[PDB]
Design a protein around this ligand. Structure first.
Ligand SMILES: *[C@@H]1O[C@H](CO)[C@@H](O[C@@H]2O[C@H](CO)[C@@H](O)[C@H](O)[C@H]2NC(C)=O)[C@H](O)[C@H]1NC(C)=O
Ligand SMILES: *[C@@H]1O[C@H](CO)[C@@H](O)[C@H](O)[C@H]1NC(C)=O
Ligand SMILES: *[C@@H]1O[C@H](CO)[C@@H](O)[C@H](O)[C@H]1NC(C)=O
Ligand SMILES: *[C@@H]1O[C@H](CO)[C@@H](O)[C@H](O)[C@H]1NC(C)=O
Ligand SMILES: *[C@@H]1O[C@H](CO)[C@@H](O)[C@H](O)[C@H]1NC(C)=O
Ligand SMILES: *[C@@H]1O[C@H](CO)[C@@H](O)[C@H](O)[C@H]1NC(C)=O
Ligand SMILES: *[C@@H]1O[C@H](CO)[C@@H](O)[C@H](O)[C@H]1NC(C)=O
Ligand SMILES: *[C@@H]1O[C@H](CO)[C@@H](O)[C@H](O)[C@H]1NC(C)=O
Ligand SMILES: *[C@@H]1O[C@H](CO)[C@@H](O)[C@H](O)[C@H]1NC(C)=O
Ligand SMILES: *[C@@H]1O[C@H](CO)[C@@H](O)[C@H](O)[C@H]1NC(C)=O
Lengths: 110, 101, 114, 335, 367, 118
């Protein structure tokens, strides 16, 4: 399992996260913010199989996450913040809810 | 859940602590190693079980709201930042970071 | 929608002399199933109490005086008053009650005076 | 999957015994509960739901209450996760569920209880019987099913009458079907027992409702009673807890292939597999359910009240035909 | 020395009137040392909370009866279902006030529920009585195939069993259906000429539009519908000549609260006269027991008899001897044509108009 | 029988107002609640009616999405809300109920008064 993402940015933006190592319709996808100076944060998760979406209260109303079952890509849209972004996937054994597979990272700046 | 760890910076030629503010006999804490300019890597899960494919020099223990991490012997690899993550409640939260030198 | 107008629109005539009011509709409002037409006169002079003066073009209300009289069928209607009194100075309307025309409609109005 | 093996009971069942490209595989959550109040139930349910989105929910009950099933059904409807009642009132059968509900129960249903009853009366050719019922709920449907099954056989049943001095007087049958509650069973029966309808040849038949909690036979129950109740003697919890995962591990695997998506709860108390278990079989054992969620091969048993004043099994239901251990009725004297 | 009487309501005016009625009820009922202290709460969505909070508050208050009024208006799906389990666990009597769902009468799940308004099966009984009036022997019934539809069908079948007659056809369509053309064609092709419908407002409007398109609602037909089928835009889609029924004082709620409070007070006063009396437990947590005299007080309440008309309950735990109004659609304006007596169907001076024209009675066969 | 209405109220452009029409003196639960208009210098305009018993509602073509209606039997108080009100909406409003005479609807017989708006 390997992950790939979009390039750097410099309004609104969109970042892609493509899966090419498993069945993309089975596992959730989570988004993380890692603005320098602190550890990390948590935004939301999405299940491509059914489309159920949950969002964090702090980031509610500002980040919209969508997925495409055909191209196996994940889209997260921030509207109207300069931080490094990651898209990740759990191992699948559940309960632990840890993060094992990591992306490359897209650096957005204003 | 709010996490806090000390020291913010460590001077060695070591150990780490992470105090929290369990799930039916299971501890929910993970430690991540992040070299500069690289994505995080999971190191320890369930606060007692190490990850396969990692050197045996790493070992950890802890329970309740006080957990700690120690490493021996000391090598060039442990030269990055570290944090602790909780998963007892959603959303998850991470630590404050800890350098090494 | 049945839009009807009443001719004329005003009159300044000596009191005590008969007058004629007519309200001409587009379609025939007769309904042979119940053998009843949907006609009604109204009035409003002081306090804005629009009250049904004469309904059905053939039967007066209980309190309406004898001198008042309504008439008409199909599309043409006739409102005839034997004697004109100052108490009758007001603005009138004609309105149908047939359920076919959605919504209802109101008469043109006649601000009579003397 | 993340199966929560919930146990609400006072019986000594340990949790270490429970401990002893797959999307979920198997995960076990063990919790032992004593209180069965609405507040405790809701609090425990929400605590489990907030805990890493547990999938499977198997519950057992030691009490003999009827609202435990209602609360479990309500929680299942509001959380969208299947629930299985294994013991006690949780395993007891309720009348009518809701279409949105995903509560699947155990134990035979009332109609299925009449069929095994009439299979025994034919086997001893008591071709003349009578029906006696009271205003307790469930008599209306029991009456309708009784008449229908009689008219469609090769036996040619000779049902006498269906049923206060006149009511007891016109009774002349040998086998009597009875339907009432325990607090009323000792009352109606005592009235007739003093009148002369008990003794050598007068056989009373009652469902599991009239004879419920074992080892609680009152002072007035004529020895020689025949009733049908779920087998709780040799089918221990191990055969009743492993069966919970056997259905789910097959339903999930069958659902995954047809739909590449596994269901899950809301993961929050504040703000599929509904029709996928009709056809299912694990290791030959037909664990499939019905349209109403009832079992298809319920493990019913037939019991008799011998002289020693205790319930003992007399016959076993298997497949679709009973296998009585006597086949020729012995004699039991009462009182 | 006081009996707590819980209540659930929405409007502050509702609760003020309830408190005033309870206070006024303690005027002409003896001079002993026993009285009643009220305790009312508000509503809450997320029915888990609606059940937990109500359980905690009313159990800690240790009330004797838990009244339930109409559910919240914006959430029409809201029902006293989460209340009837929490108050049925301890066999504490419940008095529904406005809900009319017929699922409540099944007392194998909803153990301890009562009310004072007759559900929709009594409309089926009135339909049978009507069919016994105008010399009609064949009727086609269309049902929603839901729990209410099955209940209505069973009631109608039981009613027709006594008359020894039979129903020519019983149409069955799922709720919220789209294509009922086959069912309507099958009903039209048959020789039976009496049609009875019972479903939701959306389904009623849909079937009215389908019948209008199929041109089945001309002359010589018979129409009979209940209450929900002539509500909302279903009235806007309704065809001429239909016959519908509705209650009297369905949600006036004033005499409703007055009568419910009076009945509760009289039942409590009659119960406390005899010995062998217990109290509600502290079942907030840890109380696995039930009420000692639960079924006893339930029977006492169900055996009530009043003259202030009469308020008498049957074995179904409901209200009977209710009045009704008979309405015939005309010019798309509902007109009352007669009142249904307690058992008689005596009409008024109004002249009815059947689908098409004239008052002549249409037959039921295609001879 | 008599009816009571709300008092005078002026609304800024783009605002919404919820009026009421008290009812008493006749059988409320089996009646229709009609609403009218009268802009000075112009003819009246029927708006909508509401059936009391079953909340049967009808809308005019012009005001299909410009308003909403509600009722309450316990208080015998009517409810009506205006949306997207502007200066052109400035006109008097009435609540009236039709009556049945000789077993046939004879028009409007119950009337209100007042309730200005601008
Ligand atoms: C039922 O009818 C109407 C509302 O549908 C109300 O009638 C009131 O009755 C009370 C006494 O209970 C009188 O004091 C009021 O003056 C009445 N008002 C009207 C408008 O009639 C009331 O809600 C109910 N009346 C009862 C309880 O008989
Ligand atoms: C079980 O009993 C213990 C001791 O009283 C206490 O935890 C509580 O009362 C009960 N707990 C549960 C889970 O019912
Ligand atoms: C039930 O499922 C099994 C699984 O392979 C299949 O072979 C069988 O045909 C199915 N039967 C029905 C009736 O669906
Ligand atoms: C017993 O049941 C099995 C399947 O459950 C069936 O194959 C077998 O034929 C049954 N026995 C008899 C005697 O029919
Ligand atoms: C009486 O009821 C009120 C409800 O407002 C409650 O606050 C109070 O504690 C109750 N008192 C008694 C003695 O029951
Ligand atoms: C309903 O099904 C029939 C069957 O072919 C079809 O002819 C008809 O058009 C359908 N109804 C609608 C509204 O399309
Ligand atoms: C419409 O109604 C007329 C009634 O005169 C009938 O002749 C015609 O067949 C109907 N059309 C359809 C499509 O049912
Ligand atoms: C209370 O119960 C006892 C014991 O059954 C009985 O003797 C007595 O008559 C009862 N009292 C009343 C008032 O029913
Ligand atoms: C309404 O019912 C009461 C009794 O419930 C009765 O006294 C009264 O006459 C009825 N009114 C009618 C039928 O108009
Ligand atoms: C109305 O019903 C009551 C009882 O339900 C009956 O006594 C009375 O005679 C009936 N009215 C007429 C006019 O028969």
């Amino acid at each position: 399992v390997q992950l790939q993402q979009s390039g750097a940015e410099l309004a609104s933006v969109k970042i892609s996260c493509k899966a090419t190592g498993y069945t993309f319709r089975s596992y959730w996808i989570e988004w993380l913010k890692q603005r320098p100076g602190h550890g990390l944060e948590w935004i939301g998760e999405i299940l491509p199989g059914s489309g159920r979406t949950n969002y964090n209260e702090k980031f509610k109303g500002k980040a919209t996450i969508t997925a495409d079952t055909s191209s196996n890509t994940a889209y997260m849209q921030l509207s109207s913040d300069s931080a490094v972004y990651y898209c990740t996937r759990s191992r699948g054994t559940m309960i632990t809810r840890e993060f094992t597979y990591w992306g490359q990272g897209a650096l957005v700046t204003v | 859940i709010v996490l806090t760890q000390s020291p913010a910076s460590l001077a060695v030629s070591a150990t780490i602590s992470c105090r929290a503010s369990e799930y039916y006999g299971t501890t929910l804490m993970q430690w991540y190693q992040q070299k500069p300019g690289q994505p995080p890597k999971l190191l320890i899960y369930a606060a007692s079980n190490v990850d396969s494919g990692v050197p045996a020099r790493f070992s950890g223990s802890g329970s309740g709201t006080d957990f700690s991490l120690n490493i021996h012997p000391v090598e060039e690899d442990d030269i990055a930042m570290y944090f602790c993550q909780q998963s007892r409640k959603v959303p998850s939260t991470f630590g404050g970071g800890t350098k090494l030198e | 929608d049945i839009v009807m107008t009443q001719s004329p629109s005003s009159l300044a005539v000596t009191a005590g002399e008969k007058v004629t009011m007519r309200c001409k509709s587009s379609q025939s409002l007769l309904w042979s199933v119940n053998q009843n037409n949907y006609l009604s006169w109204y009035q409003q002079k002081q306090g804005q109490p629009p009250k049904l003066l004469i309904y059905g073009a053939s039967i007066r209300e209980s309190w309406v005086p004898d001198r008042f009289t309504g008439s008409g069928s199909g599309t043409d209607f006739t409102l005839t008053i034997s004697n004109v009194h100052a108490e009758d100075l007001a603005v009138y309307y004609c309105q149908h009650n047939h359920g076919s025309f959605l919504p209802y409609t109101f008469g043109g109005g006649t601000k009579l005076e003397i | 999957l993340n199966i929560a093996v919930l146990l609400g009971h006072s019986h000594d069942v340990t949790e270490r015994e429970l401990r002893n490209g797959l999307p979920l595989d198997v995960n076990v959550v063990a919790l032992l509960m004593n209180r069965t109040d609405p507040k405790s139930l809701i609090t425990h349910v929400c605590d489990l739901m907030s805990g890493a989105r547990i999938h499977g929910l198997v519950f057992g009950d030691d009490t003999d209450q009827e609202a435990v099933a209602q609360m479990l059904d309500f929680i299942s409807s509001q959380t969208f996760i299947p629930i299985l009642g294994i013991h006690g009132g949780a395993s007891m059968i309720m009348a009518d569920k809701d279409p949105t509900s995903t509560f699947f129960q155990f134990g035979a249903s009332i109609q299925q209880q009449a069929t095994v009853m009439l299979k025994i009366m034919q086997d001893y050719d008591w071709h003349v019987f009578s029906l006696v019922t009271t205003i307790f709920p469930g008599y209306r449907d029991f009456i309708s099913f009784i008449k229908t099954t009689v008219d469609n056989s090769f036996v040619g049943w000779d049902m006498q009458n269906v049923i206060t001095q006149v009511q007891l007087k016109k009774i002349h049958s040998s086998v009597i079907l009875l339907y009432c509650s325990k607090d009323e069973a000792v009352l109606i029966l005592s009235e007739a027992r003093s009148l002369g309808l008990t003794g050598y040849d007068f056989f009373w038949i009652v469902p599991s409702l009239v004879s419920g909690n074992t080892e609680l036979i009152p002072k007035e129950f004529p020895s020689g009673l025949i009733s049908v109740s779920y087998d709780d003697w040799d089918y221990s919890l191990e055969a009743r807890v492993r069966d919970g995962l056997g259905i789910l591990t097959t339903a999930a695997s069958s659902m995954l292939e047809k739909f590449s998506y596994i269901p899950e709860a809301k993961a929050s108390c504040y703000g599929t597999l509904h029709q996928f278990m009709v056809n299912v079989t694990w290791d030959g054992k037909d664990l499939s359910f019905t349209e109403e969620g009832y079992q298809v091969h319920p493990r019913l048993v037939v019991i008799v009240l011998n002289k020693d004043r205790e319930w003992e099994k007399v016959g076993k239901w298997e497949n679709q035909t009973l296998s009585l251990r006597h086949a020729v009725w012995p004699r039991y004297k009462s009182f | 020395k006081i009996v707590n009487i819980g209540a659930v309501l929405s409007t502050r005016k509702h609760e003020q009137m309830f408190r005033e009625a309870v206070n006024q009820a303690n005027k002409r009922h003896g001079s002993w040392k026993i009285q009643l202290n009220a305790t009312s709460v508000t509503h809450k969505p997320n029915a888990i909370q609606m059940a937990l909070s109500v359980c905690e508050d009313l159990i800690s208050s240790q009330v004797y009866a838990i009244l339930v009024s109409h559910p919240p208006t914006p959430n029409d799906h809201f029902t006293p279902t989460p209340v009837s389990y929490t108050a049925g666990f301890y066999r504490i009597p419940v008095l529904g006030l406005t809900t009319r769902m017929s699922i409540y009468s099944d007392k194998s799940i909803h153990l301890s529920f009562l009310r004072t308004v007759p559900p929709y099966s009594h409309q089926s009984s009135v339909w049978f009585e009507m069919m016994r009036v105008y010399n009609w022997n064949h009727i086609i019934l269309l049902v929603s195939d839901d729990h209410e539809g099955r209940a209505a069908q069973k009631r109608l079948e039981t009613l027709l069993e006594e008359r020894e007659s039979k129903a020519e056809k019983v149409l069955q369509f799922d709720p919220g259906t789209k294509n009922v053309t086959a069912l309507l064609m099958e009903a039209r092709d048959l020789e039976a000429r009496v049609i009875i419908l019972s479903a939701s407002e959306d389904d009623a409007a849909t079937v009215y539009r389908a019948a209008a398109m199929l041109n089945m609602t001309g002359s010589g037909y018979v129409w009979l519908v209940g209450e929900r089928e002539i509500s909302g835009n279903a009235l806007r889609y309704a065809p001429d000549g239909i016959i519908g029924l509705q209650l009297i004082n369905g949600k006036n709620e004033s005499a409703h609260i007055s009568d419910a409070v009076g009945v509760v007070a009289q039942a409590v006063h009659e119960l406390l006269e005899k010995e062998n009396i217990t109290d509600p437990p502290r079942g907030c947590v840890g109380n696995t027991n039930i009420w000692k005299t639960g079924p006893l007080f339930k029977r006492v309440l169900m055996s009530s008899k009043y003259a202030d008309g009469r308020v008498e309950f049957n074995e179904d735990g409901d209200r009977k001897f209710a009045n009704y109004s008979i309405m015939n659609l005309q010019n798309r304006k509902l007109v009352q044509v007669g009142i249904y007596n307690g058992t008689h169907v005596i009409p008024n001076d109004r002249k009815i108009i059947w689908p098409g024209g004239e008052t002549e009675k249409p037959r039921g066969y295609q001879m | 029988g008599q009816m009571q209405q709300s008092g005078a109220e002026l609304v800024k452009p783009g605002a919404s107002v919820k009026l009421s029409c008290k009812t008493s003196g006749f059988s409320f639960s089996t009646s229709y609640i009609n609403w009218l208009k009268q802009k000075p210098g112009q003819s009246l305009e029927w708006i909508a009616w509401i059936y009391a018993g079953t909340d049967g509602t009808s809308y005019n073509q012009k005001f299909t999405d410009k308003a909403q209606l509600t009722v309450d039997t316990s208080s015998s108080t009517a409810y009506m809300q205006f949306s997207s009100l502007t200066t052109d909406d400035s006109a008097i409003y009435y609540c009236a109920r039709e009556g049945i005479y000789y077993g046939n609807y004879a028009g409007f017989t119950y009337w209100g008064q007042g309730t200005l708006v601008t």
